[PDB]
Design a protein around this ligand. Structure first.
Ligand SMILES: NC(=O)c1ccc[n+]([C@@H]2O[C@H](COP(=O)([O-])OP(=O)(O)OC[C@H]3O[C@@H](n4cnc5c(N)ncnc54)[C@H](OP(=O)(O)O)[C@@H]3O)[C@@H](O)[C@H]2O)c1
Ligand SMILES: Oc1c(F)c(F)c(-c2c(F)c(F)c(O)c(F)c2F)c(F)c1F
Length: 316
């Protein structure tokens, strides 16, 4: 299979990208340099990750070195929840562009459907500990995203962590100018997401799978939690194919016509994770991996369950 997928804006998006959540700022510049050196052309970023300046240093060096041309890169970032107000969207995008040292993004996502009160804190709290919401309608945020396309700041816009009803609300927006190109959601063998993926794909929205390895480094992990990388059944499929378990976990979404964004700052793993274009899982393998679904959501954003647009009360 082909290394890029066609988006509904006419651009091609690499199906493998490098994740950067929790990539330490003192390690991420070299991680991105290594990634570009071994062939990655898609980097998944976000303002809330607090490391865009350092990601940008790597991108700029590789452009300067002429290792890659800007048109060959596919750089993604995301609008944080405290910038859903229509008048804040452009400045948020511009700050990301400034930090990444770019003059456009390939794709800019609404990071979550939940808007929060603007201010310095990424999770503004009331005195009782609840996140303080914004009253900005997500449709107004969407119009502000559309303006970014029309001003040349971004080539494509999309969404992340939207449930199917929330996707539908965007698709049904009165006067919709640009459809979302992508919905970026958690997806792996323990949270296979059939219903949401089918819905999005049926509407021409490309799905990006995040936490494809189950985010073993997540801060809220418990020692007894299920572990994809240690699942002997997945290890066995990997062994059959002479690949690593991580390589199977990355190839799996690729064969579902998804984009996938494994994170690493370890040079040998960055390289390992890219070596996924030289084998094929059988249909039986694919169905077997799908059968491991748990409905086990690792990124549930539990602090925000009191939000009216909190996405995970709905079945899908
Ligand atoms: N839109 C959203 O709300 C959202 C939510 C979650 C994630 N994301 C995006 O998706 C990306 C990926 O998800 P994630 O970071 O949660 O988790 P992940 O990619 O599932 O797992 C990352 C972890 O796996 C380790 N690892 C990477 N490759 C490995 C390999 N070949 N063998 C063994 N261990 C390996 C990494 O360690 P080292 O780095 O130490 O090598 C790190 O601890 C994020 O970085 C972010 O860009 C977006
Ligand atoms: O892109 C991310 C994000 F916006 C998050 F909120 C989270 C996240 C978080 F910051 C949290 F604090 C959580 O409790 C949680 F479940 C999350 F998914 C995350 F892991 C991401 F990778």
């Amino acid at each position: 299979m082909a290394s890029r997928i066609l988006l509904n804006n006419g651009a091609k998006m690499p199906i493998l990208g490098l994740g950067t959540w929790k990539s330490p700022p003192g390690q991420v510049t070299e991680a991105v340099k290594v990634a570009i050196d071994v062939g990655y052309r898609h980097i998944d970023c976000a303002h809330v990750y607090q490391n865009e300046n350092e990601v940008g240093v790597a991108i700029q060096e590789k452009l300067r070195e002429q290792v890659v041309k800007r048109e060959e890169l596919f750089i993604v970032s995301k609008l944080w929840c405290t910038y859903h107000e229509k008048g804040l969207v452009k400045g948020a995008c511009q700050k990301t562009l400034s930090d990444l040292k770019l003059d456009y993004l390939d794709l800019y996502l609404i990071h979550w459907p939940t808007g929060f009160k603007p201010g310095k804190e990424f999770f503004p709290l009331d005195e009782s500990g609840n996140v303080v919401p914004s009253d900005t309608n997500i449709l107004d945020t969407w119009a502000a995203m559309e303006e970014l396309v029309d001003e040349g700041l971004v080539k494509a816009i999309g969404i992340s962590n939207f449930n199917h009803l929330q996707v539908e609300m965007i698709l049904n927006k009165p006067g919709l100018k640009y459809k979302p190109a992508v919905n970026q959601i958690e997806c792996h063998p323990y949270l296979t997401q059939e219903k949401l993926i089918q819905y999005c794909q049926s509407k021409g929205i490309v799905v990006t799978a995040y936490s494809p390895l189950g985010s073993p480094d997540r801060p809220w992990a418990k020692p007894e939690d299920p572990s994809l990388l240690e699942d002997p059944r997945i290890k066995a499929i990997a062994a059959k194919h002479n690949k690593t378990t991580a390589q199977v976990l990355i190839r799996f979404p690729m064969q579902r016509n998804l984009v996938v964004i494994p994170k690493s700052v370890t040079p040998e793993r960055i390289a390992e994770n890219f070596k996924v274009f030289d084998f094929e899982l059988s249909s039986q393998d694919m169905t077997t991996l799908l059968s491991y679904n748990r409905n086990w959501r690792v990124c549930a954003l539990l602090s925000c369950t009191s939000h009216k647009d909190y996405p995970f009360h709905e079945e899908f």
